[PDB]
């Protein structure tokens, strides 16, 4: 019966996986072209953008989408990374491989960089590109990206947001907020199979691709994928390199279900489920990793353990039918709950119940019983 | 009932697709680790290599596997590409993005570069790396890789072979032939879902990764994927970047079926089917694109059309229940047959039958009836 | 790659089987009710009947549908069975269990009972019920049911036709021809999973169910299933006994595909494929079991073997990737080809090719080569 | 994400459904014969019986298996039915169609017939057959079958038990308890797809089939299915009437999983889950339909509603992601929980949570919060 409440893949709807069972479909096939076109439109929809913004779906995942941003860069370009933890630091790790200049702002552990501190930095020095993380998966911290952008937009040429753990769950307004690259992956809050990175580009980013050279490699140069994406939307097949055909069939079904629910409702569901889970944790007397309550993400929650060993908690919860994620930040001793994608009020009950039973057996100080009760309470106020 | 006799994906066995229907599996899951370990061993098996050779399975496909070879290179390295057509030329297109020096040898259209000509060139200039294409998909031409390598091995540091349209269908002996990188994709003669590049590295290539810097980017630096692969074989999960989890489940099932059939039998099946198809084409009085009979690949055959329009043949054959591939070489007017993966003697009958009926309707001069008869004859001598 | 060219199940379309993958559907579920209603309408469509005719879908298959006809009978009722072989004789075997009087007409082996001979019998004696077989699966013989009925309609109270191997492949006009019960199964020319019998009742048969007692048992009394069928069409769930829920989901998808193709086209496809196969057999110099050419059914062909052992032919063809059916009539030494459901021109080529190769190996006198050629010829005249 | 906590089908494991995706399997196919043989052995295993007891798997379900017991009867035979409700009464409804004499014992509503009362009746009159219901699905009442049989065995010729809602969940010892027919269906505690009745016959029942005539019809005469079952176990195909081939593939996979878990563990799991659910109901202050605690079945629990309308509860719970079953007994106002098959401790938490939230909204007097707490408590004492 095992539940996957991990950081992605999470539990995938059966209808989504089943869409990948076509034994005679390839990259030129009519069924593929249609699924690709449909998914490109789905991307515009979940990110809040009109047809002026160009969607791309490329092989790999969040990390390949991130590296592909080098398609917009030239040697010696100046980049500012606003990093709240592991995945903010990945921008720096990627850019270390390229002839570019990188400055990184970091907050105290588990905190977030204030919009004021980013504003101050973009006024001090001239940046070609600013990189933000919408939800930092290592700590469960959501950056106030709208607030940051409103402040910095006029000082910088390009703004990119890693929405890998946010798109499909948190409010995203790529066009309204004037983001140049908003990216995500297939296996998180979109709730589909892994193997794709997804990007939405502003007209300004698109102009760079159409008119300038870049420092990109071959596979991850977005100029190489553009003909494939443009073609698909005009109902034509084009070939750059073979895409994950069947993973894209599954993505199109995920997007069908997302449009059926509606993005607003889907955001509200994530807010409810996450608040319900956080109520349960607090009632138990457990501390959340994220330092600032306004930054509690609706996809990931870090749970601090004062006594028990996170490793044993994880081994134990799998035994009781839920796979959670390990905590990977040197400043904290914790584990993570992934609550995203197709997550329901019932998943919130199971999560807090499995946490209660596992911690009681391992001798972590908690208020047994209080957790599920607090969850039920929040779910009732729906 | 439509047949996919394309260049990859081709028709995928139902058992293979079904293996991807596990809705609660992620990159740390025990089921994933096991499928990854199993597939890594399968790779050693289909490429003819002992445990001293290191397998890697990365996201994307043949093009990402090819680009990842930059992990073995330094600025100003000298590379020789032996190119028989489109996919040989892709090596040059990739290496144009990197600070390296590239020389390319090309034969007459539809021919292949003789081992003597490669020998001569590696004696004239000192090369860090030589790139070969086992089967050139654009023309259906198989390079005598063993013969080339026996001649050049002592003159060059590193030898890589693009086995994208050969591995799982043609004889491959990576260790015996002393190849440093043998690569392929998931969606060709392996007969699985698209989304993966596969590589097998010699101890010498492995030593470079373990001890030297390179010109690689981030996502395609093989050093970043090595911990994941090493870990999986020791039954441990490790994370670099999310792999196409469910595509890997499918690959492990493909490898289970391959081991059941046996690699030698599988090679024999491809040889039979391809010879049977070529007999049918010849009986019809159709010319094959590949110039030299010793190079007729057992995965792809280019079919020259003297009168009818290839585009119309393709539209027509889909109507009669087979999707073939377009011919993409400026020197020829043709279409391509993909005969690889799970292909059977019965697929050979259908292919030549659908070709007969389609060409008859479009007015291409052929000997009606003779095709299927010649196919049946070859199949009967099994 | 094995082909199932048997008498039912035959090869099932993937889309049909996949429709059965819903892990949370039961007999009251909205998805089930909808599939049941849809299939009941599909039944009216493939049998040529308006809304005045009542469809029923019951558990089991052709034999349970046949036995359920006892729902229309009283003790001492007089029945005439027109039997062309094994499945005509099944009517008598069923009715032997009931307090009824049965007379059977039979022709010479492999022949059919002429409409004149049935007319003569219904004039001599008064019958409550006449039972016909549309296609007799043991011999491949199609009875001219329209001609029989036109002659006998005025002399008899009730006419039932076993369309198990005819519905979905041969012309069926239940209302126009004034049939009282036309029945079939799910696993034949409808091309779906086994586990259901299907019946279409005239207003006169329906009046019997609504107003009279019968000799029926419990499970197979159609009066017990009527509330379930009527309910489903009015969008309501009702319970008699648990039906094969998921088999019914698959049937609804089969009917979706049938309506997409159109019944007329589907009949034409079966006629083409069967004629193509018969041309191949004749060109080979093989004799067909059915004695009279006007009775050659378009779903089944019996193939006489003069020398080889049918058992060995069957073992051999499975080896070459096609499962045919055994010949089970004491008067003949033969095997059977099932060509029904999703059968295509390509299946006809494979069938005759596999027959040629298998017979050549076993030393049955045939004209090698001529078979496939004659098939191709008929397919070309499409 | 909807849960099916109904009376059968319940939620089916994905592995089980997937086993039915084989598009080229029929009744003579080697894959079918193997699945049938395997399932017949599985039946002996879950019912506690050696090879002397004969398993049969027939089309339809529990009602067809029940009617097939007429295969053991002769005109004027005397039958005693011990009926605890709806499905006990079905025995009488079936036997009303046959030339037999039926006496029925019934207890007060929601109670059960004591072994003493059955003993008294079998001493007063001589009975050919006694029919028992192991779990009466309408009320959730388990009959102490072992105790009844120990008392009556010497006074009656044949004993049959309807184990439709018990086999795979409750202890069953058919051989040790000397039962002549123990029957069930595919879609209940076995957790597979609907479409099959399953029966296990004693040597004495088998002797009747082999040596005597009966009052059975045709399709449900077990003598007609015996050659099919005997054949399959000796690895040979035989044909009586087409079985639900793909449903049988699924059943064999269900039995594979059952053997993996072990029958004793599976019984313990059902006991735990059911006790946990009953604790939750009691903590809420809800009354259970079953009158006598020793008879609380571990597959079904009737829940009495004092204020709210059962119909609205059912409509509401579907909305909150669980489908339960309606209450169908004139003496009570209630709904039913099905907790059987693949049911887990986590399903118990969800069930009582969904019940709490739904009842709170409809104004049924309950102790909010107390339910889940009591469930968690029982699960923790595992
Ligand atoms: C915020 C964030 N950004 C980037 C990534 C990298 O994504 P991927 O593993 O798909 O390459 C992740 C990893 N889940 C992530 O959570
Ligand atoms: C010989 C050859 N090499 C490289 C490639 C590129 O592979 P991919 O499309 O999977 O990136 C192909 C494409 N079929 C190929 O056939
Ligand atoms: C003509 C005919 N009638 C009746 C039947 C009985 O159908 P079933 O096996 O589904 O009970 C068959 C068997 N395929 C048949 O071919
Ligand atoms: C105890 C009992 N016996 C008999 C039956 C009848 O079974 P079916 O609906 O499969 O015919 C049922 C129905 N669930 C049952 O629960």
Automatic annotation (TrEMBL), chains A, B, C, D:
Pfam families hit by this protein: Aminotran_5 (PF00266)
Residue list for modification N6-(pyridoxal phosphate)lysine (covalent): 188
Residues annotated as domain Aminotransferase class V: 28-331
Cofactor(s) demanded: pyridoxal 5'-phosphate
Keywords recorded for this protein, A-Z: Aminotransferase, Calcium, Metal-binding, Pyridoxal phosphate, Transferase
Enzyme Commission number(s) from the entry: 2.6.1.51
An example molecular function term from Gene Ontology annotations: L-serine-pyruvate transaminase activity
Binding site for Ca(2+) 1: 15, 22
Keyword Metal-binding (UniProt): yes
CC per GO annotation: peroxisome
GO biological process: glycine biosynthetic process, by transamination of glyoxylate
UniProt: pyridoxal 5'-phosphate binding residues: 62-63, 137, 165, 187, 239, 242
Keyword Translocase among UniProt keywords: no
Entry-linked InterPro entries: Aminotrans_V_dom (IPR000192), Aminotrans_V_PyrdxlP_BS (IPR020578), PyrdxlP-dep_Trfase (IPR015424), PyrdxlP-dep_Trfase_major (IPR015421), PyrdxlP-dep_Trfase_small (IPR015422), SP_NH2Trfase/AEP_transaminase (IPR024169)
Residues that bind Ca(2+) 3: 287
PROSITE patterns found in the cross-reference section: AA_TRANSFER_CLASS_5
Binding-site residues for Ca(2+) 2, renumbered to this chain: 147
Family the entry assigns: Belongs to the class-V pyridoxal-phosphate-dependent aminotransferase family.
Name listed for the protein in its UniProt record: Serine-pyruvate aminotransferase (AgxT)
Organism: Saccharolobus solfataricus (strain ATCC 35092 / DSM 1617 / JCM 11322 / P2)
């Amino acid at each position: 019966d095992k539940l996957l409440l991990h950081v992605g893949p999470t539990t995938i709807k059966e209808d989504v996986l089943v869409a990948g069972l076509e034994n005679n479909v390839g990259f030129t096939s009519k069924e593929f072209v249609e699924a690709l076109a449909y998914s490109l439109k789905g991307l515009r929809y979940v990110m809040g953008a009109s047809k002026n913004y160009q969607p791309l779906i490329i092989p790999g995942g969040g990390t390949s989408a991130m590296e592909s941003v080098t398609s917009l860069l030239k040697p010696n370009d100046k980049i500012l990374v606003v990093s709240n933890g592991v995945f903010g630091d990945r921008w720096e790790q990627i850019f270390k491989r390229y002839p570019v200049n990188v400055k990184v702002l970091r907050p105290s552990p588990g905190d977030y960089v204030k919009p004021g501190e980013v504003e101050e930095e973009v006024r001090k020095s001239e940046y070609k590109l600013v990189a933000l993380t919408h939800v930092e998966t290592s700590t469960g911290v959501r950056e106030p990206v709208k607030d940051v952008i409103n402040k910095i937009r006029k000082y910088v040429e390009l703004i990119v947001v890693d929405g890998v753990s946010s798109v499909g769950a948190e409010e995203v307004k790529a066009e309204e907020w004037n983001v140049d690259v908003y990216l995500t992956a297939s296996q998180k809050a979109l709730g589909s199979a892994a193997g794709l990175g997804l990007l939405l580009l502003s007209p300004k980013a698109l102009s760079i691709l159409d008119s300038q050279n870049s420092i990109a490699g071959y596979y991850l140069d977005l100029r190489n994928w553009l003909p494939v994406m443009r073609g698909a939307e005009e109902g034509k097949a084009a070939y750059f390199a073979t895409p994950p055909v069947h993973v894209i069939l599954q993505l199109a079904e995920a997007f069908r279900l997302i449009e059926k629910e509606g993005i607003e409702n889907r955001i509200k569901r994530h807010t409810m489920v996450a608040s319900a889970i956080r109520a349960g944790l607090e009632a138990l007397g457990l501390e959340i990793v994220a330092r600032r309550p306004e930054s509690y993400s609706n996809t990931v929650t870090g749970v601090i353990l004062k006594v028990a060993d996170p490793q044993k908690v994880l081994a134990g919860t799998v035994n009781e039918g839920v796979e959670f994620a390990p905590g990977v930040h040197p400043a904290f001793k914790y584990f993570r709950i992934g609550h995203m994608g197709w997550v329901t009020p019932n998943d919130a009950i199971i999560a807090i119940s499995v946490i209660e039973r596992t911690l009681r057996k391992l001798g972590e100080p908690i208020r047994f019983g209080e957790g599920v009760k607090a969850v039920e309470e929040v779910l009732f106020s729906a």
